[PDB]
Ligand binder design. Structure first.
Ligand SMILES: Cc1cc2nc3c(=O)[nH]c(=O)nc-3n(C[C@H](O)[C@H](O)[C@H](O)COP(=O)(O)OP(=O)(O)OC[C@H]3O[C@@H](n4cnc5c(N)ncnc54)[C@H](O)[C@@H]3O)c2cc1C
Ligand SMILES: Cc1cc2nc3c(=O)[nH]c(=O)nc-3n(C[C@H](O)[C@H](O)[C@H](O)COP(=O)(O)OP(=O)(O)OC[C@H]3O[C@@H](n4cnc5c(N)ncnc54)[C@H](O)[C@@H]3O)c2cc1C
Ligand SMILES: NC(=O)C1=CN([C@@H]2O[C@H](COP(=O)(O)OP(=O)(O)OC[C@H]3O[C@@H](n4cnc5c(N)ncnc54)[C@H](OP(=O)(O)O)[C@@H]3O)[C@@H](O)[C@H]2O)C=CC1
Ligand SMILES: NC(=O)C1=CN([C@@H]2O[C@H](COP(=O)(O)OP(=O)(O)OC[C@H]3O[C@@H](n4cnc5c(N)ncnc54)[C@H](OP(=O)(O)O)[C@@H]3O)[C@@H](O)[C@H]2O)C=CC1
Lengths: 442, 442
């Protein structure tokens, strides 16, 4: 409904928060409301000693309902995947929003305390705009607007409904765990509670002292876990990569993917006949699934209207943002392999100028073309759909930055679009090396 | 056994940590070992979304065993009483150890994230000296040394024993809750789970939106809760003080102490015939009890040898530190109404120089005199035994600072003793006013 006045933002995490600030900066909307199931903003940067109560093993359904921990004495808690000693894998020179720097003397790859404090400070001015401890149940286009159904998170809260001209989903994509359905795993898991875990459950490494562990995966979660487990777990630590690996030392034994778990002998069979036994813990660091747990959106199955299928990505989103069929529905934060805060801010700035009419999206067919060209380049690798590994991310943000400058009319105060110059790009290109040197590794 | 070589430190919180650094700085001990049940150091500055599982109501037994939250997927968690939005009530100019300042741009009364990060940085170099996830079961003088019995915190850990020449208990005193045994309370509590809470269970204020609450107490926990509940709880918030209070506005109603809870009408009777009804939450902000949960120490009942009785304080500790009967047993962190970090450091510096022989304690009778004079001044108010409200704390720390200077011989590197000059004392005297202005209150 072009003239947009009332906007609903689903999620008060880093993406939702920056989206709110960008929208409010347009000085064109009458109502900007954020919905958050947690008692506080900041998304995953809400460290919780509390673990998810029921980890589905295996896990391939991207719809899976998130079950918070409830009690008569506390507000419902939604566990965050952050672990106790976590430090960022993104340097301070790049990871913050462009209009809020880190205090002087911050470590280049700070502890999560620093980022949680950063988010706390960022969210402060937006608290009166957020409906905290409120779980959005569903979203759907009814009549000429969007109807978002939500229920206060507390026991006994009534189910409510409100309508908006636009809805920005910033619900995050690191909540629903992804554990491949291997033959025998389920049984192997239910026979010994605690024998099979997912990275989202890791908190304190002292739990693994003396234990023989198998880390399954080969990305940041896997490599980080292997590192944190090295000084405590029984040597060597095993790591199952898809296509094996080369590292075969005393403390680390990279092996090929898993074929099946033998529940009786509790043996683990790896592609290539390789067999493992006496594994105390199997920790799945296999990532997550994208999720759109909203009935009216999840039922959409047709190629032209669907949003989610296998959870490898969110479909039909021009520039990973605007729902092609109806641009009054957008997403912020879907990007993979990026520096989160700056990337979501880049999208937010663009999103705001488009919903306030100060910018126009290309035609619908041209948007669909953009998608067709993307799918083609993916070569069937749909889980790479939202991946913007450098230099894609730098190009992407600078593209949005330049598009935003075209907005008219010019406002007295223009919400900033980040831009990565030669200096920034360089850091982003050697990011993992700069990180390795910081933690004295590799 | 005068020549002390092996020291055991119970607790790896702010007190235990500074005790360790002071001891190691004497370069006179062969072994300094810290025991900590939590998976990490920092004591209460380990924010836990997890609540204590079983809150005893009422609670007057200072022996009460602390039951951590266990699961097959995680290390046992010992809940900390810190709440989500907590900020310090001690200014940065005074609260840190004298040899570790806060980063520039830190708020005068920072969020707990800052303090948790501060403690993380402080504890780092001591990790190899700490036995993490290890619960000390008991402590006792057998033969010529102390035998500390401990059990790894994980399921299946074996009970172990080690002997030391000295033991420093830094187990903290804000764990065992204190809830007076009011008539009817127990029943009133068990009939409606969640109706009666203790400040140690407070985490997120959104749980109380729309609820009618009764805050019981009149110190920092009570005043802070009332403040945090004001913008969400049903107006007015009731506060039961011992002797009533004067504030009787729209949002706050101070009333006198409680006489009994009527389980049937669920009414609350306050001294003076005043009666309350329809109270959804009763939150006890009545403090904690001191605790020495070690069998061989708790059985000690005689006036000359006892350590704990009603939990109002720890008995027979010269200068609140050295166990008079046997100075090889000491305590750090017992002080009440002080700025914790500096005060424990002051004790630690003194403690180290005494256990390394570089300082001598006065005679046993003179120590007992010190105690007799203290008890006399208390006028039967035993829970004020360890209270060092300004100017007592300033005097105390400066006394220890000056005593420590007498140590001989002088070492190349002398672990520092904090000292509060005119400038520091002034801040400490107007501390609560400086705080009130900071949070724009009172
Ligand atoms: C273990 C781990 C480590 C990481 N380390 C880094 C790092 O070092 N650096 C970095 O830049 N990024 C890191 N990230 C990435 C992280 O995703 C981002 O920093 C940041 O959380 C981006 O958040 P968002 O708002 O998009 O998502 P989220 O932070 O996931 O926030 C989504 C929010 O929306 C809420 N929500 C969802 N659905 C609903 C609903 N239906 N109703 C109400 N509320 C809802 C959630 O409860 C949550 O608060 C890490 C992620 C993980 C999992
Ligand atoms: C809600 C709240 C707010 C506070 N706010 C402030 C503030 O703003 N500023 C300030 O200066 N102080 C504040 N304090 C005070 C706080 O006590 C100190 O900052 C600090 O925790 C001093 O700690 P410690 O080492 O003496 O005790 P603790 O921090 O309690 O640490 C004791 C440690 O020993 C461990 N332990 C105990 N018994 C055993 C055992 N048998 N075996 C193994 N491990 C054991 C514990 O698990 C714990 O880690 C606050 C306290 C509370 C409860
Ligand atoms: N220090 C920090 O701050 C940390 C940050 N993170 C962040 O958390 C987010 C999620 O990270 P992570 O959980 O690693 O997610 P990813 O999705 O990157 O990890 C999934 C990885 O597991 C691999 N995998 C999938 N199935 C198998 C299998 N059957 N056998 C072996 N490997 C398999 C994948 O292989 P393939 O590549 O072939 O698809 C991929 O490498 C990221 O943004 C990351 O940057 C995570 C940990 C720590
Ligand atoms: N913002 C922060 O950082 C916060 C810090 N804290 C810290 O936590 C520690 C513990 O604080 P807190 O829990 O307040 O502990 P305190 O022991 O100071 O509080 C106990 C208080 O409750 C009162 N009380 C006891 N029984 C009753 C009763 N039956 N009716 C009414 N009042 C009663 C006491 O009265 P009386 O004085 O007569 O004995 C006393 O004022 C402190 O070091 C404090 O500084 C706590 C909250 C917040």
């Amino acid at each position: 409904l072009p003239t947009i006045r009332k906007i609903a933002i689903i999620g008060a995490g880093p993406s939702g928060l920056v989206t709110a600030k960008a929208l409010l900066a347009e000085k064109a909307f009458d109502q900007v409301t954020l919905f958050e199931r947690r008692g506080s903003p900041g998304g995953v940067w809400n460290y919780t000693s509390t673990l998810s109560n029921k980890l589905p093993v295996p896990s391939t359904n991207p719809i899976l309902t998130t079950e918070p921990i409830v009690g008569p004495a506390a507000l419902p808690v939604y566990p965050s995947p952050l672990y106790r000693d976590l430090q960022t894998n993104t340097p301070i020179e790049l990871m913050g929003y462009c209009d809020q720097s880190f205090k002087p003397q911050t470590l280049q790859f700070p502890h999560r305390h620093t980022i949680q404090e950063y988010q706390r400070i960022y969210a402060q001015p937006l608290l009166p705009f957020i409906k905290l401890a409120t779980d959005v149940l569903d979203i759907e286009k009814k009549d000429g607007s969007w109807v978002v159904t939500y229920k206060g998170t507390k026991a006994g809260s009534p189910i409510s409904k409100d309508i908006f001209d636009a809805v920005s989903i910033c619900n995050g994509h690191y909540e629903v765990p992804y554990i491949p359905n291997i033959k025998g795993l389920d049984e192997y898991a239910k026979a010994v509670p605690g024998s099979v875990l997912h990275s989202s459950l890791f908190r304190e490494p002292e739990l693994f002292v003396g234990e023989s562990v198998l880390v399954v995966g080969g990305a940041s979660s896997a490599n980080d876990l292997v590192r944190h487990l090295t000084p405590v777990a029984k040597h060597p630590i095993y790591q199952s990569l898809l296509g094996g690996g080369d590292i075969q030392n005393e403390s680390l034994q990279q092996v090929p993917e898993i074929t099946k778990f033998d529940p009786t002998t509790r043996e683990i069979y790896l592609k290539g006949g390789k067999v493992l036994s006496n594994i105390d813990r199997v920790i799945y660091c296999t990532g997550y699934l994208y999720s759109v747990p909203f009935p009216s959106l999840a039922k959409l199955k047709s190629p032209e209207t669907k949003l989610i299928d296998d959870g490898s990505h969110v479909h039909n989103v021009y520039q990973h943002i605007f729902y092609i069929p109806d641009p009054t529905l957008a997403f912020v934060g879907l990007a993979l392999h990026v520096v989160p805060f700056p990337t979501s801010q880049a999208q937010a700035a663009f999103l705001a100028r488009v919903w306030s009419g100060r910018l126009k999206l290309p035609s619908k067919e041209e948007q669909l073309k953009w998608q067709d060209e993307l799918m083609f380049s993916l070569s069937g690798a749909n889980n790479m759909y939202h991946s913007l590994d450098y230099p894609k991310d730098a190009t992407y943000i600078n593209k949005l930055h330049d598009w935003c400058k075209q907005a008219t009319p010019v406002l007295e105060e223009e919400f900033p679009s980040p831009y990565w110059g030669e200096k920034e790009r360089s850091i982003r290109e050697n990011m993992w090396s700069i990180r390795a040197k910081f933690f004295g590794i590799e």
